[PDB]
Symmetry: C2
Subunit: 155 residues, 2 copies
């Protein structure tokens, strides 16, 4: 049930302060196109992943949907839209399961996004050392939570 | 093939310097029992996960195997034992797939370990701010890589 899954999201985010939620959301919104670019560079360059993707599908649909996915993940806690976000993650998971996207590639995708966001946070001059470190831990937690809910469809 | 998967591990780690490999491996070896404790606290407390675990199995087998798993992951790059590590990850994945461990719980497990290791690195006074930040990015990369190879069994 989405109401149950919303608690898991809420609890995970409640480990951090709104300052981490905002620092993460700002770096993601300012770089969402560049994050989509990096995601599809990594996937299209591997033939095992490129097997499931066309250049047309990524150009006209997925590049934009990835940006929307990122905005949704980092908006959930600040806008208190937990139930709606987990419901969306659930449906995204159902799409991947239906067409047999290997789960190991989804985890690699999450890994690539966590890496690039945390690299961008390290460069963010507006944040202190402790602020950035807290934000990077939150990025890993919230991205992994999103991907966990995407992976419910595989069981 | 493990030789192919070893390249993926090598490439992922080659993004960082030996200083990140060593800082990560030291915090993990010094806290491996405490990391196992946190892992099994999180799993045994959730009834959906506790469904697949007995207190006896964790006490007498898995608590020790989790410590061994952690040591293996953070030894691979420093000891250049890439092929052996990926081969071990592959077999660990086969165990979980055989007994239908939900993949979403494995990702949650990886998330819990990444969080606690990065929290311990933040507290490590022997590291500078940039050193810790680089090490935390490596922890997320290498843990996620290990879990990716565990998840090959699910496809
Ligand atoms: C964490 C990683 C991923 C995220 C966040 C993600 C995100 C999404 C989203 C939001 C959609 C919905 C698009 C639409 O149907 O409206 C989607 C669909 C899709 N994804 Fe992913 N995805 C991920 C991993 C992957 C991987 C690894 C592959 C393949 C190698 C893949 C291939 C696809 C395909 C083929 C569709 C269906 C597009 C269409 O036919 O509608 N995705 N993904
Ligand atoms: C990233 C997460 C995980 C890691 C690193 C991990 C590690 C391992 C390792 C190294 C083994 C081999 C033990 C042995 O057979 O020699 C194992 C087996 C096993 N794991 Fe996990 N595991 C993870 C996730 C999970 C989850 C989420 C569950 C269940 C909720 C689970 C339940 C089991 C069970 C039941 C066995 C078989 C024990 C026995 O019958 O031999 N594991 N795991
Ligand atoms: C999904 N790209
Ligand atoms: C596997 N505990």
């Amino acid at each position: 049930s989405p109401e149950i899954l919303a608690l898991r999201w809420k609890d995970t985010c409640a480990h951090y302060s709104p300052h981490e939620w905002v620092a993460a959301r700002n770096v993601v919104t300012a770089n969402k196109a560049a994050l989509a670019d990096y995601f599809y560079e990594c996937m299209l360059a591997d033939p095992n992943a490129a097997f499931f993707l066309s250049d047309q599908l990524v150009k006209t649909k997925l590049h934009a949907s990835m940006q929307d996915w990122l905005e949704s993940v980092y908006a959930a806690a600040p806008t208190e839209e937990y139930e709606r976000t987990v419901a969306f993650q659930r449906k995204v998971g159902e799409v991947h399961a239906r067409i047999d996207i290997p789960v190991h590639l989804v985890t690699r995708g999450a890994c690539a996004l966590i890496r690039r966001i945390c690299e961008l946070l390290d460069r963010d001059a507006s944040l202190s050392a402790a602020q950035a470190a807290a934000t990077c831990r939150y990025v890993a937690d919230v991205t992994m939570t999103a991907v966990e809910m995407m992976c419910h469809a595989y069981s």
